[PDB]
Design an enzyme around this catalytic site. Structure first.
Site, PDB file in Angstrom:
ATOM      1  N   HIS A  38      41.529  78.887  83.711  1.00  8.72           N
ATOM      2  CA  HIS A  38      42.308  78.881  84.947  1.00  8.72           C
ATOM      3  C   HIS A  38      42.569  80.277  85.549  1.00  8.72           C
ATOM      4  O   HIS A  38      42.171  81.292  84.967  1.00  8.72           O
ATOM      5  CB  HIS A  38      43.645  78.169  84.737  1.00  8.72           C
ATOM      6  CG  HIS A  38      44.493  78.744  83.643  1.00  8.72           C
ATOM      7  ND1 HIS A  38      44.186  78.600  82.310  1.00  8.72           N
ATOM      8  CD2 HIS A  38      45.669  79.416  83.683  1.00  8.72           C
ATOM      9  CE1 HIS A  38      45.130  79.155  81.573  1.00  8.72           C
ATOM     10  NE2 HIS A  38      46.044  79.659  82.382  1.00  8.72           N
ATOM     11  N   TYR A  54      46.623  77.489  87.808  1.00 14.01           N
ATOM     12  CA  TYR A  54      46.009  76.507  88.681  1.00 14.01           C
ATOM     13  C   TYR A  54      44.526  76.503  88.354  1.00 14.01           C
ATOM     14  O   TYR A  54      43.937  77.535  88.106  1.00 14.01           O
ATOM     15  CB  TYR A  54      46.228  76.865  90.159  1.00 14.01           C
ATOM     16  CG  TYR A  54      47.671  76.804  90.652  1.00 14.01           C
ATOM     17  CD1 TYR A  54      48.193  75.634  91.150  1.00 14.01           C
ATOM     18  CD2 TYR A  54      48.512  77.916  90.588  1.00 14.01           C
ATOM     19  CE1 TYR A  54      49.530  75.540  91.589  1.00 14.01           C
ATOM     20  CE2 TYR A  54      49.839  77.832  91.019  1.00 14.01           C
ATOM     21  CZ  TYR A  54      50.334  76.630  91.513  1.00 14.01           C
ATOM     22  OH  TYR A  54      51.645  76.537  91.920  1.00 14.01           O
ATOM     23  N   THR A  55      43.939  75.333  88.280  1.00 12.95           N
ATOM     24  CA  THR A  55      42.513  75.262  87.978  1.00 12.95           C
ATOM     25  C   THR A  55      41.895  74.661  89.215  1.00 12.95           C
ATOM     26  O   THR A  55      42.195  73.522  89.532  1.00 12.95           O
ATOM     27  CB  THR A  55      42.242  74.345  86.789  1.00 12.95           C
ATOM     28  OG1 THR A  55      43.257  74.562  85.818  1.00 12.95           O
ATOM     29  CG2 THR A  55      40.936  74.726  86.161  1.00 12.95           C
ATOM     30  N   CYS A 232      46.448  67.343  79.190  1.00  5.62           N
ATOM     31  CA  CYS A 232      47.196  68.220  80.049  1.00  5.62           C
ATOM     32  C   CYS A 232      48.186  67.308  80.797  1.00  5.62           C
ATOM     33  O   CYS A 232      47.792  66.513  81.669  1.00  5.62           O
ATOM     34  CB  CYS A 232      46.258  68.928  81.044  1.00  5.62           C
ATOM     35  SG  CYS A 232      47.118  70.058  82.249  1.00  5.62           S
TER      36      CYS A 232
END
Ligand SMILES: Cc1cc2nc3c(=O)[nH]c(=O)nc-3n(C[C@H](O)[C@H](O)[C@H](O)COP(=O)(O)OP(=O)(O)OC[C@H]3O[C@@H](n4cnc5c(N)ncnc54)[C@H](O)[C@@H]3O)c2cc1C
Length: 260
Positions: A38, A54-55, A232
């Site tokens: 990320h 944030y990916t 996640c």
């Protein structure tokens, strides 16, 4: 490392869901974000530099810009979190033309190629993947999913996704996932779970409620070795709702369970 990106565009996918397109300073480049990792969108709000992970949802090959699917945590919305989200309200506040600071690549997971993985230094491989997530915890998963399918049909890694939410109007990359699921039946299996059915009249055909052992039992594959599990989701979910059930499904928690 550090990169300065301008917010080139914003999109309201829904009342609290935006799509932001950030430009990289050099228009001939890709954001070389290795799969499984990320970026941190850093920003100084009020008096402190906030750092959030944030990916990106864009193709690894996207030249010039990268996109972020951001779920905005407004204020005057939650009993326990009355003043909303810090970074999410900050980004939603930015007018397009503004600059952002991305730090990367961070992470400990990397999907080097075909079932192969690089976790905390160690190298591993898997044939069946168990991806259990909730809310925006889907982006890390959607990165691998996109990778594997891109490397099709050589990288035939098997993925089993259990995507949990609160409403059908909250499933994030739904169409994308539904669209793929139709194309690569052999590769990816998708199953949604939702706390409530806003419009049951239309007929919700997946699970209703929370993630239960009955759900994991019939949607995640058997544990053992060569079956990796990635998850996640919010803390309580990883907690009560996931690890024990997967433990009960005989997945080595240590060498086989990862959280993004
Ligand atoms: C690997 C990784 C990838 C991630 N990828 C993404 C991504 O791609 N896209 C994305 O959008 N997010 C992603 N996140 C989430 C990101 O880490 C943030 O925490 C998220 O942006 C919220 O940050 P914030 O600064 O707005 O919230 P914070 O101020 O840190 O507060 C978050 C807490 O307040 C609660 N909260 C406040 N208001 C509300 C409300 N109105 N409704 C519900 N809960 C509320 C939240 O529930 C949460 O518990 C990722 C995280 C990691 C670890």
């Amino acid at each position: 490392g550090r990169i300065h990106c301008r917010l080139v565009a914003k999109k309201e996918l829904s009342r609290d869901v935006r799509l932001f397109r950030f430009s990289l300073p050099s228009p001939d480049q890709v954001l070389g974000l290795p799969i499984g990792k990320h970026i941190f969108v850093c920003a100084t709000i009020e008096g402190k530099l906030c750092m959030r992970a944030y990916t990106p949802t864009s193709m690894v090959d996207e030249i010039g810009h990268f996109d972020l699917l951001v779920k905005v945590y407004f204020k005057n919305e939650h009993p326990k979190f009355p003043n909303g989200g810090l970074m999410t309200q900050y980004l939603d506040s930015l007018p397009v033309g503004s600059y952002i600071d991305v730090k990367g690549p961070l992470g400990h997971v990397e999907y080097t190629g075909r079932g192969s993985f690089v976790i905390n230094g160690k190298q591993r491989n898997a044939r069946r993947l168990a991806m259990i997530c909730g809310g925006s915890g889907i982006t890390p998963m959607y990165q691998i999913i996109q990778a594997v399918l891109r490397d099709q049909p050589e990288d035939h890694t098997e993925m089993h996704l259990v995507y949990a939410n609160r409403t059908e109007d909250d499933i994030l990359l739904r169409d994308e996932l539904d669209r793929w699921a139709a194309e690569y039946p052999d590769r990816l299996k998708v199953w949604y779970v939702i706390d409530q059915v806003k419009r049951p009249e239309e007929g919700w055909k997946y699970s209703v409620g929370f993630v239960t052992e009955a759900v994991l039992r019939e949607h995640v594959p058997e544990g053992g070795d060569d079956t990796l599990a990635l998850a996640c989701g919010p803390p309580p979910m990883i907690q009560f709702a996931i690890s024990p059930n997967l433990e009960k499904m005989k997945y080595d928690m240590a060498n086989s369970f990862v959280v993004f």
